[PDB]
Amino acid sequence: GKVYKKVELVGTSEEGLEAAIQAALARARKTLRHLDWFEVKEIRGTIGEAGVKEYQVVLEVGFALEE
Amino acid sequence: GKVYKKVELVGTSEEGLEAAIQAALARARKTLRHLDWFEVKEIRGTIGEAGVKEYQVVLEVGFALEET
Amino acid sequence: GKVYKKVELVGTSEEGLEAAIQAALARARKTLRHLDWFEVKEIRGTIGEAGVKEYQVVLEVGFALEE
Amino acid sequence: GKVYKKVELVGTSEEGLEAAIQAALARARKTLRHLDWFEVKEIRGTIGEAGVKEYQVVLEVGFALEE
Amino acid sequence: GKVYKKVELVGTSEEGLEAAIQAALARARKTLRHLDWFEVKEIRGTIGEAGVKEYQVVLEVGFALEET
Amino acid sequence: GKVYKKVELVGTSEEGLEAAIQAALARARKTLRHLDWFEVKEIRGTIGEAGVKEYQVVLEVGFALEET
Amino acid sequence: GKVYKKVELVGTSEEGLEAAIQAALARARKTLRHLDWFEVKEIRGTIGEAGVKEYQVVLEVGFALEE
Amino acid sequence: GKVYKKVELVGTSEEGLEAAIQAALARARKTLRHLDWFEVKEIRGTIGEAGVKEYQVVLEVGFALE
Amino acid sequence: GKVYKKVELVGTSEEGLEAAIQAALARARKTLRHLDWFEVKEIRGTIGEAGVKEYQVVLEVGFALEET
Amino acid sequence: GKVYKKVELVGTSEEGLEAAIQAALARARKTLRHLDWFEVKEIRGTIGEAGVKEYQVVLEVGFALEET
Amino acid sequence: GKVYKKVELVGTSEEGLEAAIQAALARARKTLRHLDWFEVKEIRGTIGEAGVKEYQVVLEVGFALEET
Amino acid sequence: GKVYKKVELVGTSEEGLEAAIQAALARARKTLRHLDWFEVKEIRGTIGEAGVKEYQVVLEVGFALE
Ligand SMILES: CC(C)(COP(=O)(O)OP(=O)(O)OC[C@H]1O[C@@H](n2cnc3c(N)ncnc32)[C@H](O)[C@@H]1OP(=O)(O)O)[C@@H](O)C(=O)NCCC(=O)NCCS
Ligand SMILES: CC(C)(COP(=O)(O)OP(=O)(O)OC[C@H]1O[C@@H](n2cnc3c(N)ncnc32)[C@H](O)[C@@H]1OP(=O)(O)O)[C@@H](O)C(=O)NCCC(=O)NCCS
Ligand SMILES: CC(C)(COP(=O)(O)OP(=O)(O)OC[C@H]1O[C@@H](n2cnc3c(N)ncnc32)[C@H](O)[C@@H]1OP(=O)(O)O)[C@@H](O)C(=O)NCCC(=O)NCCS
Ligand SMILES: CC(C)(COP(=O)(O)OP(=O)(O)OC[C@H]1O[C@@H](n2cnc3c(N)ncnc32)[C@H](O)[C@@H]1OP(=O)(O)O)[C@@H](O)C(=O)NCCC(=O)NCCS
Ligand SMILES: CC(C)(COP(=O)(O)OP(=O)(O)OC[C@H]1O[C@@H](n2cnc3c(N)ncnc32)[C@H](O)[C@@H]1OP(=O)(O)O)[C@@H](O)C(=O)NCCC(=O)NCCS
Ligand SMILES: CC(C)(COP(=O)(O)OP(=O)(O)OC[C@H]1O[C@@H](n2cnc3c(N)ncnc32)[C@H](O)[C@@H]1OP(=O)(O)O)[C@@H](O)C(=O)NCCC(=O)NCCS
Ligand SMILES: CC(C)(COP(=O)(O)OP(=O)(O)OC[C@H]1O[C@@H](n2cnc3c(N)ncnc32)[C@H](O)[C@@H]1OP(=O)(O)O)[C@@H](O)C(=O)NCCC(=O)NCCS
Ligand SMILES: CC(C)(COP(=O)(O)OP(=O)(O)OC[C@H]1O[C@@H](n2cnc3c(N)ncnc32)[C@H](O)[C@@H]1OP(=O)(O)O)[C@@H](O)C(=O)NCCC(=O)NCCS
Ligand SMILES: CC(C)(COP(=O)(O)OP(=O)(O)OC[C@H]1O[C@@H](n2cnc3c(N)ncnc32)[C@H](O)[C@@H]1OP(=O)(O)O)[C@@H](O)C(=O)NCCC(=O)NCCS
Ligand SMILES: CC(C)(COP(=O)(O)OP(=O)(O)OC[C@H]1O[C@@H](n2cnc3c(N)ncnc32)[C@H](O)[C@@H]1OP(=O)(O)O)[C@@H](O)C(=O)NCCC(=O)NCCS
Ligand SMILES: CC(C)(COP(=O)(O)OP(=O)(O)OC[C@H]1O[C@@H](n2cnc3c(N)ncnc32)[C@H](O)[C@@H]1OP(=O)(O)O)[C@@H](O)C(=O)NCCC(=O)NCCS
Ligand SMILES: CC(C)(COP(=O)(O)OP(=O)(O)OC[C@H]1O[C@@H](n2cnc3c(N)ncnc32)[C@H](O)[C@@H]1OP(=O)(O)O)[C@@H](O)C(=O)NCCC(=O)NCCS
Ligand SMILES: Cc1cc2nc3c(=O)[nH]c(=O)nc-3n(C[C@H](O)[C@H](O)[C@H](O)COP(=O)(O)O)c2cc1C
Ligand SMILES: Cc1cc2nc3c(=O)[nH]c(=O)nc-3n(C[C@H](O)[C@H](O)[C@H](O)COP(=O)(O)O)c2cc1C
Ligand code: NA
Ligand code: NA
Structure with a gap:
């Protein structure tokens, strides 16, 4: 069936943990669907x-690979 | 001596990490002492x-067991 | 080359995770350079x-050893 | 938000790994929603x-706690 | 086949390690078979x-689930 | 000497474990040498x-990297 | 009380996971009781x-030591 | 230099942890130097x-290879 | 809030496990509060x-740090 | 703030451990900045x-992602 | 299919890490094929x-078991 | 019986792993017995x-407490 890929990112922020996570995810969203x-x-x-x-x-961020 | 049980819960929240933890603990307190x-x-x-x-x-949430 | 040391601290706070981390670091900087x-x-x-x-x-807090 | 519980079970089977997993899940389904x-x-x-x-x-089997 | 449940307990004792383990198991056997x-x-x-x-x-303590 | 890369994939299948592994590897072979x-x-x-x-x-899937 | 030994084997098979496990155990029983x-x-x-x-x-395969 | 072997044993006892460890070591000493x-x-x-x-x-029990 | 330090010790004893733990703690309390x-x-x-x-x-031994 | 990517490589060499690490990093720097x-x-x-x-x-090798 | 055995050795050397690994392997090949x-x-x-x-x-050292 | 302390250090070197380990140990010996x-x-x-x-x-470096 479906196949996923996981990539390891490091988000950073001076503000806090949630902000660091959100920064990594915002960057991932620019190029990954x-x-x-x-x-x-x-x-x-x-x-x-x-x-x-x-x-x-x-x-680690998991995403579905397109067909 | 005293005996404790640990249960594994998953708290969730759209707001943040602390809110997710708090959600799990609030639910646990409804039924566990x-x-x-x-x-x-x-x-x-x-x-x-x-x-x-x-x-x-x-x-994991640890709580002391009451005697039977 | 240079040498570092790591010490293990436990920060606490009623406020949150970041506050607990900051409490440990604030204590550390009172005496460690x-x-x-x-x-x-x-x-x-x-x-x-x-x-x-x-x-x-x-x-764990890592710091450079002087000399 | 929603809260989940995880319970640890051991499924067994003479037939194979999938059968052992399925046995644990079949038992869990009898009493857990x-x-x-x-x-x-x-x-x-x-x-x-x-x-x-x-x-x-x-x-480990994860399930949503009802309200 | 047969299904087992594992539960996570913490036994305590002032006396020693074996006594702490035994305290957990003694409490478990009051209610678990x-x-x-x-x-x-x-x-x-x-x-x-x-x-x-x-x-x-x-x-962790493992026990066989009764079947009905 | 040779250098390899490892990528982390998740194979899925309704059929079983081997089928899930095979699905990941079949997809990997479409684009990786x-x-x-x-x-x-x-x-x-x-x-x-x-x-x-x-x-x-x-x-994790390990593959040898071609020279540039 | 009695004493056991554990040995580490790697079973292989083109057929599947169970077959790989069984191959290791079949080899083990040729010489171990x-x-x-x-x-x-x-x-x-x-x-x-x-x-x-x-x-x-x-x-790992565990077996009782005789005597 | 010198080379050591490690083997994995399981000692048992009804009485306690030390006794279980000692049982494994007592068996090991019968055949291992x-x-x-x-x-x-x-x-x-x-x-x-x-x-x-x-x-x-x-x-795990570690011993020097002769 | 309060800050704790953890230090890593190795207690030893010919007598048993509890005695080895107690030896580490007896030494620790000579200098640590x-x-x-x-x-x-x-x-x-x-x-x-x-x-x-x-x-x-x-x-690991955990102790509360005095506040100056 | 800035975002980093980590990739998992396996460097190899007949010569030694440092040489194996260096082989991975030399290949990485051909294409990664x-x-x-x-x-x-x-x-x-x-x-x-x-x-x-x-x-x-x-x-694992960590590198800073370029920003546009 | 083929079956392998793993054994755990400790190589030592005053010279370095590679030398310690090589010492373990040199001893292993005296008796293991x-x-x-x-x-x-x-x-x-x-x-x-x-x-x-x-x-x-x-x-850990892995070797293929001869089939009798 | 005897009690040991373990401390965690990070040695560094441009040259290699052994040199990094040796740097940490050389610094430790300046003040620890x-x-x-x-x-x-x-x-x-x-x-x-x-x-x-x-x-x-x-x-981790282990040393006997006096
Ligand atoms: C279903 C489940 C999530 C519901 O949990 P819950 O909302 O806490 O509801 P419970 O029925 O457990 O209520 C808590 C009980 O613990 C008791 N209790 C609370 N704190 C206690 C304590 N510290 N010591 C002893 N008993 C305590 C309560 O009095 C109550 O008992 P009672 O109904 O006999 O009066 C929970 O029972 C569960 O996860 N069960 C395990 C399911 C499982 O593993 N199934 C096997 C499938 S194969
Ligand atoms: C600052 C620091 C890195 C300097 O280490 P150092 O170079 O060894 O310097 P020290 O002055 O401590 O010298 C070592 C001491 O151990 C003693 N010593 C050496 N070997 C010993 C041994 N085997 N047994 C007992 N004592 C020994 C020395 O005599 C000396 O004792 P002294 O301080 O009473 O004179 C070290 O003190 C440290 O890591 N501090 C931790 C501080 C910390 O965690 N702060 C809390 C922040 S919240
Ligand atoms: C008790 C303790 C937490 C107090 O920590 P502390 O307040 O930071 O005091 P320390 O002397 O250990 O460390 C601070 C010293 O390190 C030195 N120092 C600070 N940064 C340094 C650095 N980067 N490099 C070298 N030295 C440094 C300073 O000279 C300072 O002395 P100061 O307070 O007079 O300015 C700490 O000393 C400790 O963990 N001790 C327990 C040791 C132990 O394990 N006991 C054995 C039990 S069996
Ligand atoms: C004994 C045990 C194995 C039985 O598990 P079980 O067959 O699933 O029965 P439980 O009562 O725990 O859980 C079922 C109940 O949970 C409730 N439930 C099911 N799904 C639920 C969900 N998603 N949310 C909330 N409640 C739910 C139901 O009311 C159900 O009752 P029902 O089966 O009649 O419909 C399990 O309760 C257990 O492991 N208990 C261990 C107790 C323990 O650790 N003791 C301490 C020893 S020291
Ligand atoms: C609260 C708790 C510790 C009390 O445990 P306890 O002292 O063992 O008491 P219980 O009420 O669970 O009694 C044990 C049950 O297991 C059953 N049981 C015992 N051995 C069994 C076995 N081998 N197979 C099946 N059932 C068994 C008993 O018959 C009994 O059920 P019964 O009263 O319907 O006959 C335990 O129920 C628990 O951990 N629940 C936690 C609930 C939870 O996680 N809540 C969610 C919070 S968000
Ligand atoms: C998006 C993605 C899943 C698509 O993967 P894919 O289907 O394999 O498609 P690719 O574009 O990677 O094609 C594989 C490439 O590797 C090359 N290749 C295949 N095997 C190779 C090998 N062994 N050595 C060197 N190159 C090889 C192929 O020739 C092809 O290159 P080309 O298009 O320049 O000709 C993948 O590119 C990816 O996961 N990227 C990482 C995304 C990421 O981490 N983003 C950061 C967000 S913050
Ligand atoms: C069967 C078994 C449990 C019996 O162990 P045992 O009681 O020690 O019996 P042994 O006959 O091996 O005696 C120990 C041997 O080690 C030797 N020896 C003892 N100390 C030694 C040392 N320090 N250095 C080198 N050799 C030593 C003894 O002289 C004896 O040698 P020998 O067999 O040439 O006479 C053990 O051989 C074993 O675990 N076999 C593994 C088999 C296996 O993994 N099979 C593959 C299945 S697929
Ligand atoms: C090479 C090797 C895989 C061969 O395994 P093997 O074919 O099972 O042969 P072993 O002698 O080790 O073990 C079998 C023996 O254990 C004995 N035995 C079997 N089960 C036993 C048990 N439950 N309790 C005690 N002894 C038992 C039998 O007498 C048997 O002798 P047999 O083949 O003549 O019937 C194994 O001996 C081995 O792993 N050797 C490598 C040791 C090593 O690490 N070398 C040092 C390198 S530096
Ligand atoms: C350099 C790098 C960080 C850039 O990541 P990126 O910005 O996400 O760009 P990528 O090309 O990898 O991935 C984006 C592409 O994946 C594709 N894509 C996005 N989501 C996808 C999905 N769900 N399924 C399949 N393809 C998808 C798109 O075609 C996309 O192109 P687009 O952004 O123009 O729409 C990343 O590719 C990387 O980490 N590469 C490392 C290479 C490496 O390990 N080299 C070996 C050194 S030894
Ligand atoms: C195949 C692969 C190993 C080839 O790696 P490579 O030799 O580095 O070659 P690439 O094509 O990825 O080149 C590196 C890219 O990263 C970009 N890059 C380098 N450093 C960067 C940085 N710091 N920030 C952003 N981008 C960077 C380069 O510009 C280049 O992209 P470009 O050609 O568009 O300019 C690698 O692309 C890969 O691992 N992809 C695997 C795909 C995968 O997982 N497929 C799914 C199978 S199911
Ligand atoms: C003692 C010991 C270190 C000696 O190791 P060693 O020098 O390699 O010597 P061995 O006696 O094991 O000889 C190696 C055996 O493996 C055989 N062998 C080598 N390579 C092989 C391969 N690839 N496939 C099958 N057999 C092989 C050799 O022919 C030899 O068999 P033989 O003794 O029947 O002639 C090792 O046998 C051992 O660790 N055994 C301890 C057993 C144990 O745990 N004791 C129980 C204590 S409670
Ligand atoms: C050497 C060592 C084992 C000696 O431990 P020790 O016997 O407890 O003696 P110390 O010198 O650390 O004294 C304990 C200190 O903690 C203080 N203290 C005790 N409990 C405390 C508490 N709860 N809160 C704050 N301070 C406390 C004591 O008053 C004493 O301070 P003082 O020396 O300024 O009077 C220990 O200091 C150590 O491990 N340091 C090594 C540093 C190191 O890593 N060196 C760098 C090598 S590269
Ligand atoms: C990180 C950490 C771990 C702890 N682990 C345990 C535990 O293993 N068992 C226990 O009874 N108390 C544990 N405690 C509680 C402490 O032993 C102590 O009672 C508590 O921190 C209050 O300390 P204080 O009075 O010095 O402030 C732990 C506390 C912290 C901070
Ligand atoms: C569990 C296992 C782990 C292995 N790990 C490695 C590895 O670390 N690096 C490597 O180059 N080969 C690795 N291999 C491959 C073996 O070294 C060997 O080449 C292969 O099993 C063929 O062995 P044979 O010719 O004796 O049958 C591994 C094989 C197995 C079975
Ligand atoms: Na030597
Ligand atoms: Na002693």
Whole structure:
């Protein structure tokens, strides 16, 4: 039957975790169709003088391959 | 000594991660007593027109068992 | 080359996940210099009458060792 | 929003892996509604004089909780 | 064929690891039948003035489902 | 020496596990050359009226990269 | 009490997963007694013109030690 | 340099975890020399009327090859 | 809110697992305050003429950080 | 903010582990820009008459996506 | 079809990682035939006055079983 | 009995994995005594024009507490 592909992206944001996830998905939507689900693999980030600099959310994004 | 049970729930929300966790715990409190801690096992979700459609947080919820 | 150290902290907050992460980092910067990155190992928490009582984020914090 | 529960079952069969999975799901269907997805956690089994005696498939079954 | 259910319990005891496991299994047998095997998932515990306060053993318990 | 790429696909089938794997590989062969090995990462699926609706096998597929 | 040993084998078959498992167990029983249980560790395989060339199932086989 | 072998055994005991580990090691020493270290991989067991029937400790045993 | 630190210790004992855990915690309390919980990461050991020589329990110990 | 892509490669070399990693990165830089970091996932290899034939290093490579 | 066996060895060397792997494989080929692949499970070692004393590479070695 | 501490360090080197491990251990020996064993947890690194820029070996270092 149907076949899906999963790609691993890292979304980033200074604002928070949801914003980082949304950034990855917004970029994926620019070029990929039939985006269906995501899976967070890791949460990492950088540190600056005020604490978190960048939140970095590593996620897999699954999409249906067209026929 | 005391014995606990852990149950695996999936909370969902369109709003965010915290809201998804809170939804699972609010449902658990309707029928379970002595809810003590949770552990997030996975964060997953669905995708729609605006990016995230539903955040889905898979968590274990630990509660103390009453004596029989 | 240079050497880094990683320490494991648990930040807590009633407010949310980001707040718990920031609490750990704020404590770290009181005494540690050259804080560079973090890795979330676990998200846990406690439960009370309002649902989540404390969010607890277990993270590794990496920093460069001086000299 | 909606809340799901996951339960861990072990389906067994002398015939094969699919039969073991189907046995677990058939039993779940007797008493649970809104069964949605499954995740295989482990494949194990017993050995007899002719090789595999019983295939044992450990799986999580997710279902939507009714309101 | 036969179907088993696994449940995740946490047994606790001040006395030791075996005692913590036994506490979980004793509670399980008050209400569950055909208990067959267990799997330890984690060993944790709390700390007090004299070292270990409670040993806490997280384990899966498997039991055969009755058939009707 | 040689360099390979691994891509993560999900094959699906109503028929079984082997059929789901085969579906992923048949699709991969339409556009990729030098397909060499696969690794099953997960087995998942959906549930319907007759039990399993779709078997979903998540696998990594390794292929040798051609020189540029 | 009694003691068991576990050995790691890889069964292969062009036919399917069950056949690969059975091939490993058939080889094991030629020389090992008191074969009791198996645990699948990995499912892998090779690819050729027809899709799957060989299914390869990595499993642990547990047996009771005599005496 | 020196090469070690690891084998995976499962010791059992009705009494406890240490006894199960010791049972595996006692059997290993009957036929294997230069036993050096062990690693517990899993703790499992069976259930009976008294609670635990058998503790089953799965462990890797490392020994120096002669 | 409150911040905790985790440190990784290895307790050892010829006597058993509980004794090895207790040895790590006894040493920890000589210098660390507000010790709260532990997590066993690994159980390992050495072998001698009579079987187990030393039990070695690798554990994480969590403690609440004092606020200055 | 900025978005990165990770791809999983397997570099190989008869010479050693570093050479296997370098082979993957050399191939990646022929076609990918803004390569930033890598993560080794597995070390494997093949065996021949004289011991190691090929070292095989499975690694994730992260690169920053260009923005338009 | 064909059946393989995997055995777990630890190669050691003062020189480096490749040398430790090669030591395990050199010993394996003294007694085992049809050695095909290896998988590194762990890299560990001992420490002495000058840093690394022994590199210790824990690996699985797979070989094809002869058919009688 | 005896108690050990483990600390997690990241050694780096442009040259290779062994050199990165040795850098971490050389730094540890400046201030820590009774260094006994290490465990590699991760191998990561950065990429530059020459391929690898820095190898980064994350390792646990175990030492006996005095
Ligand atoms: C169906 C299900 C989701 C409904 O859950 P629920 O909304 O919590 O409703 P329940 O019937 O379980 O109610 C909770 C019960 O636990 C009791 N309870 C609550 N907290 C407790 C505690 N800490 N200690 C002991 N008992 C407690 C409640 O009193 C209530 O018992 P009662 O109805 O006898 O008075 C749940 O029962 C379930 O997941 N069952 C498992 C299904 C399964 O695995 N089936 C096998 C298919 S093969
Ligand atoms: C800052 C840091 C990196 C410096 O490490 P360092 O180079 O070893 O410097 P130290 O001053 O600690 O020297 C090592 C100490 O261990 C002692 N020591 C060395 N070997 C020892 C052994 N085997 N057993 C017991 N003590 C030993 C030394 O004598 C010295 O003791 P002293 O501080 O009482 O003089 C280290 O202290 C650190 O990682 N701190 C963690 C801080 C932290 O996590 N902060 C909380 C943030 S929220
Ligand atoms: C208790 C503890 C949390 C306190 O942390 P702390 O407040 O940061 O104090 P530390 O001395 O450890 O670390 C801070 C020091 O590191 C040094 N330092 C900071 N950043 C550094 C860096 N990048 N490189 C080198 N040194 C650095 C500073 O000199 C500082 O000293 P200061 O507070 O006077 O400015 C910490 O020391 C600890 O985890 N100790 C427990 C150790 C243990 O495991 N005990 C054994 C039990 S069996
Ligand atoms: C004993 C057990 C296996 C029986 O499972 P079961 O046959 O599915 O029966 P349950 O009562 O749990 O669940 C069925 C009930 O859930 C309810 N239900 C079914 N689907 C539901 C859904 N989607 N949402 C909410 N409720 C649902 C129904 O009311 C149903 O009753 P019904 O079958 O008459 O229609 C299961 O309840 C169990 O594993 N219990 C373990 C208890 C335990 O862990 N004890 C602690 C020992 S220390
Ligand atoms: C609350 C809870 C811990 C209480 O467990 P408990 O003390 O074992 O009490 P139960 O009411 O479940 O009794 C055990 C049931 O299992 C049945 N049972 C026992 N062994 C069985 C077996 N081998 N096969 C089938 N059924 C069995 C018993 O007959 C009994 O049902 P009965 O009262 O209808 O005869 C347990 O029911 C539970 O974990 N439910 C959680 C509900 C949940 O997850 N809610 C959703 C929150 S969002
Ligand atoms: C969209 C997608 C699924 C379509 O895959 P596809 O059906 O295989 O189609 P492709 O365009 O990739 O065709 C395969 C290409 O690989 C080449 N190729 C096949 N095997 C090869 C090999 N072994 N070595 C080198 N090149 C090979 C083919 O010649 C073809 O190249 P060409 O069109 O330049 O001639 C796939 O391109 C993809 O998943 N891209 C990644 C998307 C992504 O991650 N986006 C980021 C969002 S933030
Ligand atoms: C059957 C089995 C459990 C019996 O184990 P055992 O009690 O140790 O019996 P053994 O006869 O092998 O005795 C141990 C051997 O190791 C040797 N030995 C002991 N310590 C040694 C050491 N440190 N270094 C090298 N050799 C050593 C002994 O001298 C003896 O050698 P020998 O057979 O040449 O006389 C064991 O052989 C086994 O697990 N076989 C695996 C078979 C298998 O996987 N089959 C494939 C199925 S598809
Ligand atoms: C090569 C190998 C696969 C051959 O396996 P095998 O054909 O089963 O031969 P083994 O002697 O090991 O095991 C079979 C023996 O175990 C014994 N045995 C069988 N079941 C047993 C049980 N339940 N309890 C005790 N002994 C048993 C039998 O006496 C049998 O001898 P037999 O073939 O004459 O009937 C196996 O011996 C092996 O894995 N060797 C490699 C060891 C190694 O790691 N080498 C070091 C490299 S550095
Ligand atoms: C470079 C890269 C990040 C760009 O990703 P991208 O912006 O999404 O562009 P892609 O060409 O890969 O994918 C988009 C194309 O996929 C196709 N596509 C989109 N959705 C699809 C779907 N559901 N099914 C099939 N095709 C689809 C479209 O034709 C699309 O072209 P379009 O955007 O003009 O409409 C991505 O291709 C990549 O990661 N490549 C890595 C290459 C690599 O690993 N090299 C080996 C180094 S050793
Ligand atoms: C086949 C494959 C390995 C070839 O990889 P390749 O040698 O890198 O060649 P590509 O054609 O992908 O070239 C790299 C592309 O990434 C783009 N790119 C490089 N770095 C980039 C960056 N930092 N940001 C955005 N794009 C970038 C390049 O510009 C180029 O696209 P262009 O030719 O349109 O300019 C690779 O495309 C691939 O893995 N696709 C697999 C397809 C797949 O999974 N198919 C589904 C089977 S079911
Ligand atoms: C002790 C041990 C390390 C010695 O390893 P070794 O030096 O390779 O020596 P072995 O005795 O195993 O000899 C290798 C055997 O494999 C056979 N062999 C080699 N390659 C083979 C292949 N590809 N296919 C089939 N057989 C093969 C050899 O011919 C030899 O058989 P033989 O002894 O009947 O002549 C190893 O046998 C072992 O780990 N056994 C321990 C058993 C155990 O776990 N004991 C139980 C303790 S509780
Ligand atoms: C060497 C070491 C094992 C000694 O541990 P120790 O016996 O507990 O002794 P410490 O020097 O850490 O003293 C404990 C400190 O924690 C403080 N403390 C205890 N509990 C505390 C708490 N809950 N909150 C805050 N501080 C606390 C103590 O007051 C003491 O501080 P002080 O030294 O300023 O008086 C430990 O400090 C260590 O592992 N450091 C190694 C650093 C390292 O990694 N070196 C870099 C090598 S590359
Ligand atoms: C990340 C984390 C893990 C914890 N794990 C356990 C546990 O294993 N068992 C337990 O009884 N308490 C556990 N606790 C609770 C603590 O032991 C302690 O009771 C609580 O944090 C209050 O500590 P304080 O009074 O020092 O603030 C955990 C707490 C945190 C922050
Ligand atoms: C489970 C398993 C894992 C394998 N892993 C690798 C690998 O890591 N790298 C590789 O080049 N070949 C790998 N192979 C291929 C084998 O090394 C070998 O080439 C193949 O099984 C043919 O062996 P034979 O000629 O002895 O039958 C693997 C094979 C199996 C069965
Ligand atoms: Na040596
Ligand atoms: Na001791």
